[PDB]
């Protein structure tokens, strides 16, 4: 028998590593606001979760929305059994409809507590270690042709075989970016051109027609699924859908249409690790390749990502990412590690992460039974 | 770290409690043939699982198929970590395609071992106790109409408030059998008419038109999904689909069509608890009412059923049944308990059931290292 | 009048002529396990049939399943009239649902008995000799450039005009294999790239795109039909479906969608010569090109293949294969022949084959009336 | 080895046993014009076939069309092997397109020859005796309440349990016919209202709505399939489709829509026994109830019908009919028999009928090798 005796909410800043990070149609990242949920039990077990967006207009999700949900839910979540992850899921969904991003860090703490109570890592409770090290990608580059060929060779020797070309702000120069990058990677390598919902549908098509002879992954060219499918009418490139993959309902529709070659799964865009796990399991059973990820964050959100990716079948997992190494600051102590281009989950009980209390500060809100 | 060190296959007879069990187009269960899989490990943890068909021609499943599969798979499973349920699932699926019924006892034994290794019941590893005592039904087999009135008094006495009327042997007398049964039930009580694929489409339509002024659940009127949809065109009765619900592919088709009011989920028909869980979770998310069951069997089969039912949201769980109480003989020691017409899962680690070695006899096959 | 008086089951090892057979996503048939069914009658007419899998995970079928089926069904088949193939078909399908592969050798033995009782070869009862010598293909060859050009020349000289490029284990080098083999063929000639369910959907699309300028038959690129259709969205190459063609239900779907250019018909994957003939005749009437085959096997299986091929209209028959020539051991005495790259059925009554009792050994099971 | 040496065409009058035969929207058949084909071989095996329309405007078929087909095709069939029924089918279809009704007597004669060459009845060559005595219907009656009771009592005692009401000339009084006939038959019995393509779609709907509380079979209410489907939008009655079922293509459409509860199969409307068998087997595999019959005719047409019925699975065979007993004159010697309201095929080799050369008179056309 277990009871939740306390809920606290922490908030901190996570500056970008380079200082400047561009995405989509001219968006700006410099500081990302983190929300850390800490849940305490009468047996002295404590779990932590995290939601951090990559921009406040990236998905149907913003940083102040975690506080507002917690204020309604946390008094109603006190005295309840936290290792019963699905029971907590249904209770949080009975308290407020939608708002999945805000429930996400609570759910990760519940999975963390389940892991500690069972003496097992989170990947074990998600089915086992189906992937020994998730493959990763490098977000490189932007620079000169001679510098690009050098930096790709530094990524190649480090073990990276997959590269993201960040596009979506100017379809015409994006054509030039794609055309110049692809002869610079060698035979076995993957390039994904992510527009981050950035192109208008006509301009997306012009780019597809101009790069029709080329082998790359066309990733989220437009905002809606319907615009993306309209681009797909012309585009033969393996299409990766990301921001529009908001849950099981959209996954069902992507499957019904065979509407993408890769589905990108962001844990908090799917509304928590419980819902993210169910969407991937559905997509895997329908033999759809997936990426296992979250929007942004430090060690705590990255620990959930690592366990999500390790529990994905190796045959169908395209990549994952090391979200904690995109920041100069931290949210938790521990989390996942990176070894030779691959992302590895912890094998210790729970999420393998505890809150970095000194980085976060005193809690901004607090509910004790 | 854990390894499978021994696999034993057991076979035993399970005689029916009321002599004959009339189901379908003229079939009968007097003695059902149980198949029990016992898995040993190097840490001394033992898991067990059971498949028992309710008739050898009922679904795409028969008792001798378990032996056949076990001969092919069991040497390949020795030395493997049975706690990693999804890894075993994919291993078994890599070794043979389909034949899910035969993989089902092995899958139940893994969830048993993982349960013991975590110190938790199977319902906790399936999400939590989302239902505290599954509302039960009792099947009233194909007998005379004067002696099913007394059987519905006998089953109501045992605390059941839901009754499955076995029909499907003759549409004409089945109309009479339905019309006589319905005014013999009190407020709050439900009836389902299960034809067990027995009716021809034209006859099923005739039955549906003749009983249009009545409230009962029309269950699997014909063999195929398509046939049942042809009936549904005319039949306004809530339709339960059962035998044709073979997996997630069918679940997807049923949801796309909104093709039933109830989907029955038999563990062995879905290919084990791992796959059953996922079809359950998919249907609940699409707000399809479910029944959590298996085909037939003793305490071991019933243990997996009870944990499956307990982790199903009570809002969407129509019923389950106590399979172990249909037989005069046992497969297991322990298992689930029933109290006032509700089925309760065990709260002890693992499945909460061990093999009844004295009832089972010497194993028919034994693989060790 | 005729009655089955004895059913015997034989099992034997069929080793591959060239050691190992590399198919699909990295699989190997070093030794195949043959299942031979032998049926005796009260007029002393004997029938025989064979199911042998090309890998135990190739389709929904394994070698131990025949044994399992026979144990349940054979006591019920004694005393029954084997000439009446549809009655026997019916009976089997009443005893078990699905498991068509296991029913397949029984069905072939019945067609064998009907042929002997009517004094006609099996092709005659299948409709007549609609093809005089079925075209064949060679697997060809994974070698040098000169050694390939020379080995294709000797197969060409021997009468072969069609070649199978075995692919499916590595999309990237599979591109190279297709690109290197096509300029080595001359122009009346046909290449089929069989991935054997090997590719992930995205990689199959990459391959199809990189070889869009090339004329070849793209064969079963992915596991499921839906995945193959997703590849077909992009690939203009004639598509051959094979392992997903499991029955009439699927053929209807394929025809409705116009979803392939060639349908590959494996006798045992269709559930026997009775269901294979009906699926064949359905596709032919809808003007779909067909291949007439089976999974694997000796002379007994090949005899069923040859008569199946001989009764396929020449205009729509793509090829067949000499399965008996892939092994170093025999299941049968007699069987079909190969002349100038073409497969010829026997013209003597029945299947044209008797069991090689010296090779088969002691029967593993024997039921007598 | 066998060769067609001689083809003869005969023509004869078959007067209706009860004067005039009222069907559809104002049609009457008093004398039907039979076309009998007689095929001789070099081994002295003779085969016969028959097509007789029930009215020249009944289906896409008339009596004079057999002559026309024969004059074009018969010189091209001399020297051919008649036992190879699919080779003959495909030769005919190569010589002319469509006109299957005219090919139908030739097809029957080839099945006759094959049965003689193999020493087996045609039902054996169509799979076996899957129905022992096909159930029959009586087209009765059409008169007063006192006279209908006496007529249904003699039919009941004679074994009949199924009754056709000939309607379709006046929807308004067809409502009254249905309404007055249905309560004059007991629990087990059945009744089909055959409008024989006769109602206009709005009138068919008015009839459907007026009788929406009644248990009968709505048979071919309108001419086209689409008109029938429009009626079916409103009509919950089991729908029987007949004249519009012209072949496999239409049977595929019917299956896809699940657009009927019974399909009526007329051998000559399907283009002969070969296509008729393939269409039936397809519908039975899709679990559609069928009627096995033909348009009209004497002992030769009825022999083919009885063999067609006998090889239809009894679970799915609704009824058949004794065509020879509707006429006062003969086309053949032998044919099927009737006992206790069931139609029985012959067990002797071939069709079980020879041409009644004395009734047929001089051959109208004669082709010799
Ligand atoms: Mg992205
Ligand atoms: Mg049921
Ligand atoms: Mg193939
Ligand atoms: Mg009719």
Q: Could you tell me which of B77, B64, B72 has the C-alpha nearest to residue B110?
A: B77
Cβ neighbours around D322 below 10 Å, total: 21
CA D250 → CA A143, A155, C228, C283, D257, distances in Å? 64, 62, 28, 15, 11
Cα separation of D160 and D340, whole Å?
Answer: 8
3-state secondary structure of C175: helix
Enter the DSSP assignment of C277: H
State the catalytic residue, choosing from A103, A166, A240, A275.
Answer: A166
Chain A within 8 Å of C226 (Cβ-Cβ)? Answer: yes
The answer to whether the CB atoms of C209 and A236 lie below 8 A apart is yes
Whole domain around residue A235: which residue ranges?
120-356
Nearest by CB to B128, which of A84, A285, A311?
A84
Packing angle between helix A201-210 and helix A225-232, nearest 10 degrees?
A: 30
Which residues of chain C make contact with A286, given a CB cutoff of 8 A? 226
Cβ-Cβ contacts under 8 Å between B and C: the total is: 56
Which residues of chain A make contact with C209, given a CB cutoff of 8 A? 215, 236
CA atoms A24, A27, A32, A36: torsion sign: negative
Q: Which of C202, C233, C234 to mutate to test the interface with A (most CBs of A within 10 A)?
A: C202
Same domain? For D178 and D292 the reply is: yes
Same domain? For A252 and A317 the reply is: yes
Which residues of chain B make contact with D313, given a CB cutoff of 8 A? none
Q: Could you tell me which of D242, D172, D185 has the C-alpha nearest to residue D216?
A: D185
Same domain? For A6 and A30 the reply is: yes
3-state secondary structure chain D: CCCEEEEEEEEEEEEECCCCEEECCCEEECEEEEEEEEEEECCCCEEEEEEECCCCCCCCCCCHHHHHHHHHHHHHHCCCCCCCHHHHHHHHHHHCCCCHHHHHHHHHHHHHHHHHHHCCEHHHHCCCCCCCCEEECECCCCCCHHHHHHHHHHHHHCCCCEEEEECCCCHHHHHHHHHHHHHHCCCCCEEEEECCCCCCHHHHHHHHHHCCCCCCEEECCCCCHHHHHHHHCCCCCCEEECCCCCCHHHHHHHHHHCCCCEEEEECCCCCCHHHHHHHHHHHHHCCCCEEEECCECCHHHHHHHHHHHHCCCCCCECCECCHHHHECCCCEEECCEEECCEEECCCCCECCEEECHHHHCCCCEEEEC
- Based on the structure, what is the number of domains in chain D? 2
Q: Any binding-site annotation on A194?
A: yes
Distance from CA of A63 to the nearest CA of B (A): 27
Q: Give the ligand at the shortest distance from the Cα of A319.
A: 1
- Who contacts B128 (Cβ-Cβ below 8 Å, separation ≥6)? A81, A83, A84, A85, A86, A87, A88, B311
3-state secondary structure chain A: CCCEEEEEEEEEEEEECCCCEEECCCEEECEEEEEEEEEEECCCCEEEEEEECCCCCCCCCCCCHHHHHHHHHHHHHCCCCCCCHHHHHHHHHHHCCCCHHHHHHHHHHHHHHHHHHHCCEHHHHCCCCCCCCEEECECCCCCCHHHHHHHHHHHHHHCCCEEEEECCCCHHHHHHHHHHHHHHCCCCCEEEEECCCCCCHHHHHHHHHHCCCCCCEEECCCCCHHHHHHHHCCCCCCEEECCCCCCHHHHHHHHHHCCCCEEEEECCCCCCHHHHHHHHHHHHHCCCCEEEECCECCHHHHHHHHHHHHCCCCCCECCECCHHHHECCCCEEECCEEECCEEECCCCCECCEEECHHHHCCCCEEEEC
3-state secondary structure of C156: helix
Same domain? For C249 and C146 the reply is: yes
Nearest by CB to A129, which of B84, B119, B313?
B84
The answer to whether the CB atoms of B200 and D262 lie below 8 A apart is no
Which residues of chain C make contact with A188, given a CB cutoff of 8 A? 172
State the catalytic residue, choosing from C11, C103, C240, C266.
Answer: C266
Cα separation of C366 and C362, whole Å?
Answer: 10
Cα separation of B29 and B6, whole Å?
Answer: 32
Same domain? For C191 and C335 the reply is: yes
Task: Calculate Rg over the CA atoms of chain D.
Answer: 20
Half-sphere exposure of D342 (CA within 13 A, CB side): 12
Chain B within 8 Å of D257 (Cβ-Cβ)? Answer: no
Tell me which residues of B are annotated as active site: 166, 266
Q: Which of D111, D114, D123, D128 to mutate to test the interface with C (most CBs of C within 10 A)?
A: D128
Distance from CA of B119 to the nearest CA of A (A): 6
Cα separation of B26 and B14, whole Å?
Answer: 20
Cα separation of B12 and B327, whole Å?
Answer: 12
3-state secondary structure of C292: strand
Enter the DSSP assignment of C311: T
Q: Could you tell me which of D247, D240, D62 has the C-alpha nearest to residue D167?
A: D240
Task: Please check whether residue C55 is in contact with residue C27, taking contact to mean a CB–CB distance below 8 angstroms.
Answer: yes
Which residues of chain B make contact with C60, given a CB cutoff of 8 A? 97-99
Which residues of chain C make contact with D125, given a CB cutoff of 8 A? 125
Q: A217 forms bridges with which residues in the sheet?
A: A192
Q: Could you tell me which of D320, D324, D328, D335 has the C-alpha nearest to residue D297?
A: D324
**Whether residue C266 lies in the annotated active site:** yes
Compute the distance from residue C121 Cα to the ligand 3 centre, in Å.
Answer: 28
Same domain? For D196 and D309 the reply is: yes
Distance from CA of D314 to the nearest CA of C (A): 11
Cα separation of B118 and D14, whole Å?
Answer: 85
Residue B139: what are its φ and ψ, rounded to 5°? -80, 130
Same domain? For B194 and B331 the reply is: yes
Cα separation of D229 and B13, whole Å?
Answer: 52
Q: Could you tell me which of D59, D32, D29, D79 has the C-alpha nearest to residue D271?
A: D59
Q: Which chains touch B (3+ CB pairs under 8 A)?
A: A, C, D
Alpha-helix residue ranges (DSSP H) falling in chain C:
65-77, 85-95, 100-118, 122-125, 146-157, 171-181, 201-210, 225-232, 248-257, 273-285, 299-310, 357-360
Compute the distance from residue A242 Cα to the ligand 1 centre, in Å.
Answer: 5
Same domain? For B101 and B44 the reply is: yes
Compute the distance from residue D223 Cα to the ligand 4 centre, in Å.
Answer: 11
Compute the distance from residue B341 Cα to the ligand 2 centre, in Å.
Answer: 19
Same domain? For D145 and D113 the reply is: no
Task: Please check whether residue D60 is in contact with residue D89, taking contact to mean a CB–CB distance below 8 angstroms.
Answer: no
CA atoms C241, C246, C248, C252: torsion sign: negative
Q: Could you tell me which of D238, D316, D163 has the C-alpha nearest to residue B204?
A: D238
Structural tokens at position A41: 């039990």
Which residues of chain A make contact with B311, given a CB cutoff of 8 A? 86
Cβ neighbours around A249 below 10 Å, total: 11
Q: Which of D81, D86, D113, D278 to mutate to test the interface with C (most CBs of C within 10 A)?
A: D86
Distance from chain centroid for Cα D300: 12
Compute the distance from residue C177 Cα to the ligand 2 centre, in Å.
Answer: 52
Q: Could you tell me which of B366, B330, B309, B357 has the C-alpha nearest to residue B17?
A: B330
Return the residue matching tokens 């779990």: A47
Compute the distance from residue B194 Cα to the ligand 2 centre, in Å.
Answer: 6
Q: In what order do the strands lie in the sheet with D134-135?
A: D134-135, D342-344, D337-339
Transcribe C33-74 into DSSP letters.
EEEEEEEEETTS-EEEEEEB-SSTTSSS--TTHHHHHHHHHH
Q: Could you tell me which of D289, D151, D155 has the C-alpha nearest to residue D219?
A: D289
Residue of B nearest to A118 (CA): B118
Chain C within 8 Å of D132 (Cβ-Cβ)? Answer: no
Structural tokens at position A283: 């997509």
Cα separation of B282 and B255, whole Å?
Answer: 10
Compute the distance from residue C237 Cα to the ligand 3 centre, in Å.
Answer: 16
Same domain? For A94 and A233 the reply is: no
Binding residue ranges of C for Mg(2+): 194, 219, 242-243
Cα separation of A29 and C288, whole Å?
Answer: 57
Distance from CA of C227 to the nearest CA of A (A): 8
Q: Could you tell me which of C106, C59, C89, C113 has the C-alpha nearest to residue C365?
A: C106
CA triplet C279, C281, C287: central angle to 5 degrees? 105
Chain A within 8 Å of C233 (Cβ-Cβ)? Answer: yes
3-state secondary structure of C32: strand
Q: Give the ligand at the shortest distance from the Cα of D244.
A: 4
Distance from CA of A288 to the nearest CA of B (A): 14
Residue environment code for C86-96, b if the CB has 16+ CB neighbours within 10 A, otherwise e? bbbbbbbbebb
Chain B within 8 Å of C255 (Cβ-Cβ)? Answer: no
Structural tokens at position A70: 């917690």
The answer to whether the CB atoms of B202 and D262 lie below 8 A apart is yes
Cα separation of B101 and B96, whole Å?
Answer: 12
Residue D122: what are its φ and ψ, rounded to 5°? -60, -35
The answer to whether the CB atoms of D120 and C118 lie below 8 A apart is yes
Enter the DSSP assignment of C250: H
CA triplet A247, A250, A252: central angle to 5 degrees? 105
CATH number at residue D112: 3.30.390.10
The coordinates were experimentally obtained by: X-ray
Residue C151: what are its φ and ψ, rounded to 5°? -75, -30
Return the residue matching tokens 């308990």: B337
Q: Give the ligand at the shortest distance from the Cα of C167.
A: 3
3-state secondary structure chain B: CCCEEEEEEEEEEEEECCCCCEECCCEECCEEEEEEEEEEECCCCCEEEEECCCCCCCCCCCCHHHHHHHHHHHHHHCCCCCCCHHHHHHHHHHHCCCCHHHHHHHHHHHHHHHHHHHCCEHHHHCCCCCCCCEEEEEEECCCCCCCCHHHHHHHHHCCCCEEEEECCCCHHHHHHHHHHHHHHCCCCCEEEEECCCCCCHHHHHHHHHHCCCCCCEEECCCCCHHHHHHHHCCCCCCEEECCCCCCHHHHHHHHHHCCCCEEEEECCCCCCHHHHHHHHHHHHHCCCCEEEECCCCCHHHHHHHHHHHHCCCCCCEEEECCHHHHECCCCEEECCEECCCEEECCCCCECCEEECHHHHCCCCEEEEC
Cα separation of B202 and A337, whole Å?
Answer: 64
Cα separation of A325 and B62, whole Å?
Answer: 54
How far separated are the first and last CA of chain D, in Å rounded?
A: 16
Cα separation of B281 and B305, whole Å?
Answer: 15
CATH number at residue D129: 3.20.20.120
Nearest by CB to D248, which of C89, C119, C285?
C285
Chain B within 8 Å of C59 (Cβ-Cβ)? Answer: yes
Structural tokens at position A299: 């060690």
3-state secondary structure of C194: strand
Dihedral (Cα; A114, A119, A123, A126), 10-degree rounding: -50
Return the residue matching tokens 């290449």: C191
Same domain? For D113 and D226 the reply is: no
The answer to whether the CB atoms of B56 and C96 lie below 8 A apart is yes
Same domain? For B351 and B271 the reply is: yes
């Amino acid at each position: 028998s277990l009871r939740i005796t306390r809920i606290r909410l922490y908030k901190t800043d996570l500056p970008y590593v380079d200082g400047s990070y561009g995405w989509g149609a001219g968006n700006a990242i410099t500081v990302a606001r983190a929300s850390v949920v800490v849940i305490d039990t009468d047996a002295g077990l404590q779990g932590c979760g995290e939601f951090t967006p990559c921009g406040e207009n990236y998905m149907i999700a913003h940083s102040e929305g975690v506080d507002a949900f917690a204020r309604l839910a946390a008094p109603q979540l006190l005295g309840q059994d936290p290792r019963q992850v699905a029971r907590m899921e249904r209770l949080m969904d009975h308290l407020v409809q939608g708002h999945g991003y805000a429930k996400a860090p609570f759910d990760a703490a519940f999975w963390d507590i389940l892991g500690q109570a069972t003496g097992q890592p989170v990947w074990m409770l998600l089915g086992g270690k189906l992937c020994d090290g998730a493959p990763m990608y490098r977000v490189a580059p932007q620079r000169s042709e001679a510098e690009t060929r050098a930096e790709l060779a530094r990524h190649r020797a480090a073990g990276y075989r997959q590269f993201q070309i960040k596009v979506g702000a100017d379809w015409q120069s994006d054509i030039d970016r794609i055309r110049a990058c692809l002869p610079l990677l060698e035979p076995g390598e993957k390039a994904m051109a992510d527009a981050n919902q950035g192109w208008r549908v006509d301009n997306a098509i012009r780019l597809a027609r101009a790069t029709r002879d080329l082998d790359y992954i066309l990733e989220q060219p437009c905002r809606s699924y319907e615009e993306c499918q309209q681009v797909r009418r012309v585009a033969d490139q393996p299409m990766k859908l990301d921001e529009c993959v908001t849950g099981l309902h959209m996954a069902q529709r992507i499957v019904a249409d065979r509407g993408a070659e890769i589905c990108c799964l962001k844990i908090s865009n799917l509304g928590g690790l419980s819902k993210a796990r169910r969407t991937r399991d559905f997509l895997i059973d329908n033999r759809m390749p997936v990426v296992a990820e979250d929007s942004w964050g430090g060690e705590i959100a990255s620990a959930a990502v690592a366990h999500f990716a390790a529990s994905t079948p190796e045959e169908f997992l395209i990549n994952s990412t090391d979200l904690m190494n995109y920041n100069t600051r931290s949210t938790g102590l521990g989390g996942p590690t990176v070894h030779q281009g691959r992302l590895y989950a912890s094998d210790t009980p729970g999420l393998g992460v505890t809150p970095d209390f000194n980085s976060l500060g005193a809690p901004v809100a607090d509910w004790a039974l």
